[PDB]
């Protein structure tokens, strides 16, 4: 039953806080900076490394302030929290691509209304 396309999430995960890939890259890098220092400490696991490179390959923007802005311009509308990250990491070009990839965007908003937001996302891409 659990399909994020139709926006059905468990109770433990409904109230969970979404995160962007570029957003988690900064947190992981900060933890890496913390642990690489403070000697007499355990080194980082390979899981940490395989997440580091994973989120580094998809860092649409590296500035700290560019993250809260792209989320602020999104939370001002009536989108779901689930649509917050999948629509901020992939950065589709045309609104048709976003609607075809995400079935929940079909009929949820107007085409040009969606495409203006998509163009904003493309502008904020560094």
């Amino acid at each position: 039953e659990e399909d994020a396309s139709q926006l059905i999430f468990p109770k433990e995960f409904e109230t969970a806080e979404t995160l962007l890939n570029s957003e988690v890259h900064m947190l992981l890098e900060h933890r890496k900076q913390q642990n690489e220092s403070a000697e007499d400490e355990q080194e980082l696991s390979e899981v940490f490394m395989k997440t580091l490179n994973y989120t580094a390959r998809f860092s649409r923007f590296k500035n700290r302030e560019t993250i809260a802005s792209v989320r602020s311009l999104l939370l001002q509308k009536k989108l779901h929290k689930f649509e917050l990250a999948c629509l901020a990491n992939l950065c589709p070009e045309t609104a048709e691509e976003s609607k075809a990839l995400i079935p929940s965007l079909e009929g949820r908003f107007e085409d040009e209304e969606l495409q203006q937001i998509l163009d904003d996302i493309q502008t904020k891409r560094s």
Partner: protein
């Protein structure tokens, strides 16, 4: 089933196995094939380790369907003296690469044509479709042509370009300048500065017109790094001027010290790629994969040289901005596109070259194993053993045909050894074996061989290597053939069979890729590609099988030898097994070899390929078999050349051509009784007359058809010599001269002061600490220095391979 048509088709079994099926040539694509193969397979590599011949070889392989053995062994005049068996194998391997590159080029040409059609429907392709795709001499530059295509035309499956074009010297021109090393194409000034043009293109994605400058520079860098000419020039630069920098990782500094293989290059600085040794870069990459070392490939500058071209001279201050933009665009391109990818390409090339050297070393070792001859069938007695501490020794008397006749177990201690010696002598007297072979495991082989010598002198006795016998013992086939024997008995039979002929045993015990890979051909064998190493080993097997020729009538009568007619030219696992099945079912053994097609259903092309490399034991036949015998069938001679033999014999006998009594068979059946008469024949004059008659040049073939009638399957292997003292040392000890690193640290156990200190190494080598360090010859014993009985680790300072003695060090200063 694929096996059915493979067995039924008319092409060599190894031709259908290849991924790229062999398709005929045209004599114009064949010449391009030959040129490309000669240029690529005979070009100096990056690490220190006639075209008509290649044309002829490729023509044979792809049109005549002649396997590399049939070309090497019956087409010498076409390929020799510049092409040998291994050269033919390399040519046929590189034919696959040529075919892959050609198919890729055809696919890319069709893509470029479709893209041209699409653009005509609406930059464009005018000569790039021709100039690039047609001029693709490698897979790497094919990627350069394609990726450049993807950069522009990859968007369409069915405006920062303004700044990039307003950047002077379009990327093709930059590639030209780099290829020429001087500013062949001048730059194009503009009546403004970069920012003013930036205002035009700074709208939405890049406000702050510095951002549009960044975007334009990125576009220019992509266009420069995707240009095929710049790619060629920079790859060449990397090839010639490339340094290797290496540092050990945190995990590497601690666990690499004078015993880890990467010690010699734990720290490197500007090590040119040209100086990389045979397998050094393979070890470097293995160490880097293990995480205990980090490397990078660079040229340091080259950027300073490059920047002089994409540049302008005047100091107007409106071109210094353009000059700086161009300089930093080239910087970015080189730093993040060209340098990284060129380093990756160079690293891949160097690693592949190291892998190739390792494969060649394994192939050479296998060649040396299989090029060791028989002994001078013969009744061979094989003795095998183990630690021997509460473990008996088994000796197997293997008949000359290779079948084991009988075995004998040879299990205060003085009288037991005496009784064992008495029973061994009794066995030797009862069943006199021509050769007694003692396996090689440890020092106990020397004592065993010396006792066998003491027995025999009252008939040779030779030490034999024990490494294929172990694999045979552990194999399930040993269980299959001998359900009753203990494992050590299997070692004895394996040793006897190998001494009788290594080829017959290596092919029988290395029946599968896993079994062959069990052997130790080279320390880095495990890291090379399995497919290439297996292909090299099977090529060595094929060469030695065709250069020996496989006796058919013995593979059937003694099924132990069936594995040999897998490596016959023209005649593979499926084909060989089908031929054996046919012979077994018909219950008939080849009295004649042209009978192959007569009684079997093997096509003309396979018969041509295989049948030169099959022996028939014509001297061994008798009883009802006397009914049908072609006398030429007992030799290396092939049934296309059986008229030239039956002319060469007539001429060597001076038979009058006008006598109705000149029976050409009977002339051979006088020459094969008196082969010395063939020495009076001028083969060069006979060959010139065959050439005049239009039969072509056969000079070298006639010398073989003479040497062969002078001895039926004349064996060219180097005879079974006894291993040199170095061979015994490296065999019983089980480590190589490189492993005995003079100055190596070794854990040894002290045994007893015989004036020195006898330390027994775990390698079965006695260790004698010198009296100089001991300092006591007539002085008190060295007990004060160390207590007898325990173990210590010291450093070697001398070797006594002829006596299995090695100097050691007591002083820690030597340890340091």
């Amino acid at each position: 089933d694929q096996d059915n048509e493979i067995r039924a088709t008319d092409l060599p079994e190894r031709f259908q196995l290849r991924s790229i099926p062999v398709k005929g040539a045209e004599d114009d694509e064949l010449e391009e094939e030959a040129d490309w193969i000669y240029r690529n397979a005979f070009a100096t590599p990056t690490i220190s380790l006639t075209i008509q011949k290649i044309k002829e070889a490729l023509g044979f392989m792809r049109n005549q369907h002649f396997e590399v053995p049939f070309i090497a062994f019956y087409r010498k005049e076409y390929v020799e003296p510049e092409l040998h068996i291994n050269d033919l194998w390399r040519v046929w391997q590189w034919d696959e690469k040529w075919t892959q590159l050609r198919i890729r080029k055809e696919n890319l040409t069709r893509l470029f044509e479709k893209m041209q059609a699409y653009q005509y429907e609406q930059r464009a392709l005018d000569t790039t479709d021709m100039e690039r795709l047609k001029d693709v001499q490698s897979m790497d530059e094919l990627k350069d042509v394609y990726n450049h295509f993807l950069l522009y035309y990859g968007r369409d499956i069915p405006g920062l370009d303004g700044l990039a074009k307003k950047f002077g010297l379009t990327p093709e021109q930059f590639g030209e300048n780099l290829r020429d090393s001087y500013q062949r194409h001048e730059t194009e000034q503009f009546p403004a500065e970069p920012l003013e043009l930036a205002k035009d293109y700074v709208c939405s994605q890049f406000p702050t017109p510095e951002a549009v400058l960044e975007g334009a520079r990125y576009m220019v860098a992509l266009q420069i790094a995707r240009e095929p000419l710049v790619r060629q020039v920079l790859r060449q630069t990397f090839q010639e001027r490339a340094k290797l920098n290496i540092t050990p990782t945190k995990k590497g500094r601690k666990d690499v010290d004078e015993a880890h293989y990467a010690y010699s290059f734990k720290y490197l600085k500007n090590k040119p790629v040209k100086e990389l040794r045979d397998d050094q870069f393979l070890k470097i990459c293995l160490a880097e994969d293990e995480g205990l070392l980090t490397t990078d490939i660079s040229i340091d500058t080259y950027f300073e040289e490059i920047k002089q071209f994409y540049y302008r001279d005047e100091f107007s201050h409106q071109v210094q901005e353009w000059n700086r933009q161009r300089t930093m665009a080239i910087e970015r391109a080189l730093q993040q596109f060209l340098y990284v990818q060129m380093a990756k390409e160079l690293k891949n090339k160097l690693l592949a070259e190291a892998k190739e050297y390792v494969i060649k070393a394994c192939s050479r070792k296998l060649y040396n194993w299989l090029r060791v001859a028989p002994y001078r069938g013969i009744r061979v007695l094989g003795i095998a053993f183990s630690s021997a501490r509460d473990h008996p020794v088994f000796c197997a008397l293997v008949n000359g045909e290779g079948e084991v006749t009988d075995f004998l177990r040879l299990p205060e201690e003085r009288e037991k050894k005496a009784q064992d010696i008495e029973t061994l002598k009794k066995f030797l007297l009862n069943k006199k074996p021509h050769v007694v072979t003692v396996a090689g495991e440890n020092r106990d082989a020397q004592m065993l061989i010396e006792d066998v010598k003491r027995i025999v002198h009252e008939i040779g006795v030779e030490l034999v290597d024990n490494e294929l016998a172990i694999l045979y013992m552990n194999s399930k086939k040993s269980e299959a053939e001998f359900r009753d024997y203990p494992p050590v008995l299997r070692q004895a039979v394996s040793l006897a069979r190998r001494i009788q002929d290594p080829l017959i045993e290596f092919a029988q015990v290395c029946s599968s890729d896993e079994d062959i890979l069990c052997l130790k051909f080279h320390p880095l064998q495990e890291h090379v590609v399995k497919e290439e190493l297996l292909n090299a080993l099977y090529c060595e097997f094929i060469n030695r099988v065709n250069e020996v020729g496989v006796d058919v009538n013995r593979a059937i009568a003694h099924p132990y030898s069936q594995a040999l007619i897998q490596y016959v030219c023209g005649l593979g696992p499926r084909k060989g097994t089908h031929l054996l099945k046919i012979l077994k079912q018909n219950n008939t053994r080849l009295e004649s070899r042209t009978q192959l097609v007569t009684m079997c259903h093997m096509g003309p092309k396979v018969f041509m390929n295989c049948a030169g490399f099959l022996k028939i034991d014509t001297a061994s036949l008798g009883d009802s078999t006397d009914s049908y015998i072609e006398v030429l069938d007992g030799s290396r001679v092939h049934p296309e050349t059986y008229e030239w033999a039956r002319k060469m014999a007539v001429d060597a006998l001076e038979y009058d051509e006008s006598a109705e009594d000149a029976n050409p068979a009977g002339a051979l059946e006088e020459i094969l009784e008196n082969p010395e008469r063939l020495k009076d024949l001028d083969l060069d004059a006979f060959a010139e007359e065959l050439e005049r008659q239009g039969y072509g040049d056969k000079h070298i073939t006639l010398y073989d058809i003479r040497a062969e009638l002078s001895c039926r399957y004349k064996d060219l292997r180097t005879a079974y010599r006894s291993p040199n003292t170095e061979e015994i040392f490296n065999m019983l000890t089980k480590e190589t001269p490189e492993t005995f690193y003079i100055g190596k640290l070794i854990i040894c156990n002290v045994t007893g002061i015989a004036i020195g200190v006898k330390t027994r190494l775990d390698n079965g080598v006695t260790g004698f600490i010198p009296t100089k360090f001991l300092s006591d010859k007539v002085v008190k014993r060295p007990e004060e220095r160390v207590k007898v009985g325990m173990t210590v680790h010291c450093r070697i300072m001398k070797i006594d391979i002829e006596k299995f003695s090695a100097d050691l060090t007591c002083r820690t200063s030597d340890l340091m």
